[PDB]
Amino acid sequence: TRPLFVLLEIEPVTKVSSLKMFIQRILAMCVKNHGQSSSIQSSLMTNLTYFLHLSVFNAELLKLLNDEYNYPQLTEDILKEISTRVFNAKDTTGPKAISNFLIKLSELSPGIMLRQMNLVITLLNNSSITLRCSVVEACGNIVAELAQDPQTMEHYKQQIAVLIELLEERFQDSNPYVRTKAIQGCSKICDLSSKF
DNA sequence: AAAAAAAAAAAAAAAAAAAAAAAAAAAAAAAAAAAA
């Protein structure tokens, strides 16, 4: 696993679809068939902290694991680590990469990532701008895409209602960009008039 | 009974510095062009 993680550092390798797909499936088989859900998650966290272009790779790997390899525990642990992660006041690429990863994951698999959203909400208290915007955007996309399945709404009424109430309360903030993200999320929610 | 010498108004240029107008840095949204 280590040599492929080192080779993933350079950007042009990530752009090609075949190699990215092969690395995604090999990482999925490593996580599922051979366990070791601790080294791989730490490597992904290191790559996401030190690099910006690997957020989409992480989200796609998590989506592939959730769909075929039905192992949502890795995503739960990654989200918990993101919630408990601390950033310095000097670096800004780390929070931006985290934000991009959360946005892509919310675009990919709302349902798996919704389970740990209760601990993710605790990250909203951070003074970081991009992370707050990403949390708002992720909440909006999760509640918009989960709207299509009635079973998902029925089974998860309490937390989706809490998330919508928090989004409504987030209409006032020091950052205008967080307010803009909240308004965009509300627009995505109200794009359909069948329910709510 | 002119002639040096000291005291005193009058007057150039010179040095000074923090406060305000103006310009650059950083993150994000919108518009146009290229690749699939």
In the structure, how far is the CA atom of residue A92 from the C1' atom of nucleotide B20, in angstroms? 33
Give the other-Cβ count within 10 Å of A160's Cβ: 20
d(CA A196, CA A192) in angstroms, rounded, equals: 9
Tokens encoding A163: 């998330």
What would the DSSP string read from start to end of A2-53?
Answer: HHHHHHTTSHHHHHSHHHHHHHHHHHHHHHHHT--TTHHHHHHHHHHHH-ST
Overall resolution, Å? 3.0
Nearest DNA or RNA nucleotide to A130 (CA to C1'): B27
A130 CB-to-strand B distance under 7 Å: yes
For strand B, give the nucleotides within 7 A of a protein CB: 26-29
For residue A30, count CB atoms less than 10 angstroms from its CB and return exposed for 0-12, middle for 13-18, buried for 19 or more.
middle
- Structure method: cryo-EM
- Identify each DSSP E strand in A134-174 by its residue range: none
A92 CB-to-strand B distance under 7 Å: yes
A135 CB-to-strand B distance under 7 Å: no
Q: Are A102 and A62 in contact (CB under 8 A)?
A: no
For residue A69, count CB atoms less than 10 angstroms from its CB and return exposed for 0-12, middle for 13-18, buried for 19 or more.
middle
A180 CB-to-strand B distance under 7 Å: yes
Q: Are A58 and A27 in contact (CB under 8 A)?
A: no
In the structure, how far is the CA atom of residue A121 from the C1' atom of nucleotide B3, in angstroms? 102
Q: Are A15 and A52 in contact (CB under 8 A)?
A: no
d(CA A163, CA A72) in angstroms, rounded, equals: 21
